[PDB]
Subunit: 439 residues, 2 copies
């Protein structure tokens, strides 16, 4: 096929995307080896759903797993009665998700399981796929003429032809795998045909971070998790935490082969050592560098000019409340807390008013990085670690290094009960999740 593997795309037809997926154990060829993964739609990653604003999505999920499951429409500002984090689909049963794509929306989103206590093994085993909301902005020449690709970054570890099981240390750190894949392929080659590439990036890993850098090139950030920036932002590298998305333009500068790498990054994962007294926890330190793909530039590349503007960011009403949410850890117990409590699905932690704006101050008092995710209500990151954010865009995951405070501007949209949690999904499964009720 193409030298660059990408998930099959399913497009809405006449304003309707109607599709039956099955979550199923699936024999696959993966990275040169045969393995049985848990997949949506028979593939790893699952199919990319491509829709436009105001489309109707009608997705029937058939559960062919031996355990219950559900879907989280990660990043979509839809009703928590559709994107229902408490729903359980029993083995053999089906459930239809039906919603309308919001009118003021664009970007790369994704879908994956969200059944508390079972997310990490199900996501690690292969249950994920992308959703793209196309925009009228995609027609401006500087983007229309770019070569577009989706990059699903997800790692894996195999044992006996199946996803490796979680160890106790995996529940503490979040599980990372040795197979560092792009769209399920090991170090694919992207042979560019145009000098400007538009790359949609998705970190669908349980816990691995991707400190992205393209050899000899900057990246031009044009979209964050849930929407466009106001104008492109030049960066030398781009850290993508679990659950985050971005879209970048790449302007190929000369002929040649350029590595896209995940550079060394220390997220605070911990090991154990015994040096006499002991045993006690010790930092794992930075990740080893990984090559994600090989990028081959065309002959005599002449990249397009960058767009001068993208989409203006909405002016938000003045906020009506400030919240403080402190993250802490008990690493040796693999227990994780928000304001000193673990998740309880019966307990409402925050009560807010629809169509008001809130300021959320999320403080990481742990030693690990924690990527904080809020369902249903995209937010504007004002600052992290006391540094102002260099752009305005909708996000739904924000990474906090040890000790850092993020200040978020959170407009409350749809009414109902939803959740916020760490998107190191092992930590969510082990308690680092709370309940927000909007009325």
């Amino acid at each position: 096929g193409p030298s660059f593997p990408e998930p099959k795309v399913v497009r809405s037809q006449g304003g309707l995307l109607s599709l039956k997926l099955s979550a199923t154990p699936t024999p696959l060829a993966i990275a040169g080896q045969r393995a049985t993964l848990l997949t949506y739609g028979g593939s790893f990653p699952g199919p990319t759903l491509r829709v436009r604003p105001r489309d109707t999505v009608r997705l029937t999920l058939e559960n062919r797993l031996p355990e219950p499951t559900n879907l989280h429409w990660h990043g979509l500002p839809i009703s928590p009665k559709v994107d229902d984090p408490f729903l359980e689909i029993p083995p053999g049963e089906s459930w239809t998700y039906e919603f309308t794509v919001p009118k003021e929306l664009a970007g790369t989103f994704w879908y994956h399981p969200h059944l508390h206590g079972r997310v990490a093994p199900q996501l690690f085993a292969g249950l994920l796929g992308a959703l793209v909301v196309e925009s009228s902005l995609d027609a401006i020449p500087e983007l229309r003429e770019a070569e577009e690709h989706l990059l699903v970054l997800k790692d894996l570890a195999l044992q006996g032809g199946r996803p490796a099981p979680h160890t106790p240390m995996d529940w503490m750190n979040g599980k990372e795998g040795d197979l560092v894949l792009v769209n399920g392929a090991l170090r694919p080659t992207l042979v560019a045909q145009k000098a400007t590439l538009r790359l949609r990036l998705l970190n669908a890993s349980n816990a691995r971070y991707y400190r992205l850098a393209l050899q000899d090139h900057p990246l031009y950030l044009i979209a964050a998790d849930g929407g466009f920036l106001e104008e492109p932002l030049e960066v030398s590298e781009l850290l993508l935490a679990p659950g985050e998305r971005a879209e970048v333009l790449v302007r190929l500068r000369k002929e040649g082969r350029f590595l896209l790498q995940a550079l060394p990054y220390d997220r605070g994962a911990m090991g154990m050592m015994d040096m006499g007294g002991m045993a006690h926890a010790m930092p794992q330190g930075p990740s080893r560098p990984e090559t994600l793909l090989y990028l081959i530039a065309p002959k005599n590349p002449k990249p397009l000019p960058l767009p001068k503007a993208l989409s203006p960011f909405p002016t938000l009403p003045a906020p009506v409340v400030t919240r403080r949410l402190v993250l802490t850890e008990d690493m040796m117990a693999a227990r994780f807390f928000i304001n000193g409590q673990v998740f309880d699905h019966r307990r409402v932690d925050l009560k807010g008013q629809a169509q008001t704006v809130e300021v959320w101050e999320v403080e990481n008092q742990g030693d690990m990085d924690h990527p904080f995710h809020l369902h249903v209500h995209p937010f504007q990151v004002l600052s992290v670690g006391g540094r102002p954010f260099p752009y305005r865009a909708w996000k739904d995951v924000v990474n906090l290094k040890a000790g850092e405070v993020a200040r978020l501007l959170v407009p409350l949209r749809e009414k109902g009960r939803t959740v916020f949690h760490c998107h190191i999904v092992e930590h969510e499964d082990r308690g680092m999740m709370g309940v927000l009720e909007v009325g």
Copy 2:
């Protein structure tokens, strides 16, 4: 008492040192705490025996321990029928060691248990003491006028008022303790009354190395394990491996306080870590620096001149055989080998001829330092690691770093069966010992 603690001295009287020692569990005050140690003569260290050449030593060892024991007269070139490594003294029984001190002998020696499989816990618990052979060379003015002190370097760890037990890792590495003591005292102060000090140094530790350095001063080496050098040798530091002895002159250069330190040294001890895959062995790295004692110099110190000569080293006959003895390790089993075999007291490994000279090439093919010790027959170290030795003196322990070959000139003296072994005594207990028969 004196600001500088030293073991009580027992001197020969009229050419006879006749003494009854008991090896006994003993309540002591040690480093500010009460503890029960295993001691000779009720003290830790045991009493220093001080003799002259041709003295008769008659030492009755009474075993009041709950397990068998014996004595090794470490470094003395006497008969292996007296210095008997295979003898067992049962609990409650006594044995008299009787020997004549050789005529051509001088230096610092020591005594400790040597019952195979039980040495490490008995030595660690406190069973050791020094023996000094006085020399007519001690009357030359440059030594007679020096202030003489014995420094027994031995570390300890206490648990519940008793020596800490050996762990599996202790059997692999050799046990080191957190209490780093001199003559059983924690960081004593030596208030010098003379500007020249003569320090007898003994490493009586199971496994700890002492990379000795005196702040702002060199050391003048005048004797190795088993005798004087030919002339003093200036050194900036002096590594003392387990079982080694040295004598140094210190020439105090000005008033003040000077630390005698055990500087960081990496002997190849190993720990265990678990960082995801794992678990696997990892180097412990260098030891942490320790202060051994505080040295206070007198006012306006005017040190004596160094002696120009000490004792000429004997011219040895040409050697008649070359031996090769390869040291290897199985760290995870805590098994240690010489030429691929573990100790067997029934098996003779080398057979040599009395009054001939042999060349022994001892090769460390392990990753840890191993201090190689030969009973009964002191040797001349020719080279280690391919570097010629910078002095001629009798030694009976030679340290080998990983990969190093030591070339030794070994005159065979007394007839009989004796042993050679690593003086990390845990390694001896775990097999790194062989049998030499001299006829």
